[PDB]
Amino acid sequence: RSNQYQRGKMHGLKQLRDSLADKIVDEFPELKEPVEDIIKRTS
Amino acid sequence: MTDRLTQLQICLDQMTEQFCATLNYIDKNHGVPPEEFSNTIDELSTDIILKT
Amino acid sequence: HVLIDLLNWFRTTNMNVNNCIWALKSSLNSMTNAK
Amino acid sequence: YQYKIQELRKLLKSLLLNYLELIGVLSINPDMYERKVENIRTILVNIHHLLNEYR
């Protein structure tokens, strides 16, 4: 149960930050370049 | 009338409260169905953008 | 030990996650004053 | 005063960017998340300093 919770929360967080990066790129193109680096800083 | 500096303080306090609520929802909800969670987070992110 | 090692590692991950959650809650409670 | 205005705007943009990076840290490697948290607060603290001269 703990492992399933960990996997589900990891998937949720991944989709969270993917959507947040996408929208930050969308409405703020000038900050698009660091955001991808942020992914490189995280992933 | 309300002075715009007081409105600015109210806006920044509401922004801080909104970030606290959003991260609390993330912390207490990570694991709820993925679709409903994603929709609620999209609403919260739209709220973040509008507050900005 | 194989099952024991996996068991202990998963337990460590579990309460590490729980401690991270509690630390987040404590950080928000402390920082609400500075809000 | 335009310099302070643009400094505040770039600080707000950097604060949003650092919030995104910190929540990504929480996502992938939360164990060191605090390493950025106070950092973000410093920017917020700087914002308060930016209010002090505007008073």
CA–CA gap between residue B9 and residue A22 (Å, rounded):
30
Q: Give yes or no for a contact between A19 and C31, defined as CB atoms under 8 angstroms apart.
A: no
Which residues are CB-contacts of A22 (< 8 A; sequence separation ≥ 6)? none
Any chain C CB within 8 A of the CB of B35?
no
Q: Give yes or no for a contact between B45 and B9, defined as CB atoms under 8 angstroms apart.
A: no
Q: Do C25 and B23 touch (CB under 8 A)?
A: no
Q: Which experimental method was this entry solved with?
A: cryo-EM
| Chain B residues touching residue D23 (CB < 8 angstroms) | 23, 26
* DSSP character at residue B13: H
CA distance C21 to chain B (A): 7
Residues 1-52 of B with CB under 8 A from D: 19, 23, 26, 52
| Chain D residues touching residue C23 (CB < 8 angstroms) | 34
Instruction: Provide the 10 A C-beta neighbour count for residue A7.
Output: 11
Torsions phi, psi for D13 (to 5 deg):
-65, -45
Decide: residue D24, CB within 10 A, 0-12 exposed, 13-18 middle, 19+ buried: buried
Q: Give yes or no for a contact between B18 and B48, defined as CB atoms under 8 angstroms apart.
A: yes
* DSSP character at residue D1: -
Helix/strand/coil (H/E/C) assignment for every residue in A1-43: CHHHHHHHHHHHHHHHHHHHHHHHHHHCHHHHHHHHHHHHHHC
Q: Give yes or no for a contact between B30 and A14, defined as CB atoms under 8 angstroms apart.
A: no
CA distance B31 to chain D (A): 12
Q: Which of B38, A8, A22 is nearest to D20 (CA)?
A: A22
Task: Taking each helix axis as running N to C, give the angle between helix C2-31 and helix B4-29, from 0 to 180 degrees, rounded to the nearest 10.
Answer: 170
Resolution value (Å, 1 decimal): 3.3
Token representation of residue A10: 């990891």
> What are the angstrom distances between the C-alpha of D44 and each of B22, C9, C34, D18?
18, 38, 10, 11
Q: Give yes or no for a contact between B44 and A19, defined as CB atoms under 8 angstroms apart.
A: no
Alpha helices in C1-35 (DSSP H): 2-31
Token representation of residue A33: 């370049």
CA–CA gap between residue D38 and residue D12 (Å, rounded):
16
Any chain C CB within 8 A of the CB of B9?
no
Residue whose token pair is 């002090």: D52
Q: Pick from C20, C31, C34: which is nearest to D30 by CB?
A: C20
Give the torsion through C-alpha atoms of B4, B9, B11, B16, to 10 deg.
Answer: 170
Give the torsion through C-alpha atoms of C11, D26, C30, B44, to 10 deg.
Answer: -120
CA C1 to chain centre: 25
Q: Give yes or no for a contact between B12 and B4, defined as CB atoms under 8 angstroms apart.
A: no
Chains C, D: CB pairs < 8 Å: 10
Decide: residue C28, CB within 10 A, 0-12 exposed, 13-18 middle, 19+ buried: middle
Task: Taking each helix axis as running N to C, give the angle between helix D2-28 and helix D34-54, from 0 to 180 degrees, rounded to the nearest 10.
Answer: 160
Q: Give yes or no for a contact between B12 and B51, defined as CB atoms under 8 angstroms apart.
A: no
